[PDB]
Ligand binder design. Structure first.
Ligand code: CA
Length: 122
């Protein structure tokens, strides 16, 4: 792989919206990154806690699978896990931003439950 693979990988897995956005752009043009042989697979939020209200967390789960699967393959999962989990939480809270009033609170509560689950059983 290219010598700057670690820096690219780090750039796609920060907690900021610009990092999420850089990953989204790459995810939609996977072909441009073939030289890097990233694992782009995801099972979305499979095996996550219940989401009775249906908050749309699939894209957050996808970027979280990207950090886990690619850092595991790089042999540096333990050192980067807590960042990937936090970026997951930040991604979910950006979803919750689109709801206001009571619904915002319900969204944040579901996001915290998702965050806690990967922090403890991830
Ligand atoms: Ca997943």
């Amino acid at each position: 792989a290219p010598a700057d693979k670690p820096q690219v990988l780090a750039s796609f897995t920060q907690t900021s919206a610009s990092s999420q956005n850089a990953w989204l752009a790459a995810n939609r043009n996977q072909s441009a990154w073939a030289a890097y042989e990233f694992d782009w697979s995801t099972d979305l939020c499979t095996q996550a806690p219940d989401n009775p209200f249906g908050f749309p967390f699939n894209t957050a789960c996808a970027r979280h699978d990207f950090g886990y699967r690619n850092y595991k393959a790089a042999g540096s999962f333990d050192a980067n896990k807590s960042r990937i989990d936090s970026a997951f939480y930040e991604d979910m809270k950006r979803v919750c931003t689109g709801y206001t009033g009571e619904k915002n609170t319900a969204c944040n509560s579901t996001a915290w439950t998702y965050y806690q689950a990967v922090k403890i059983f991830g």
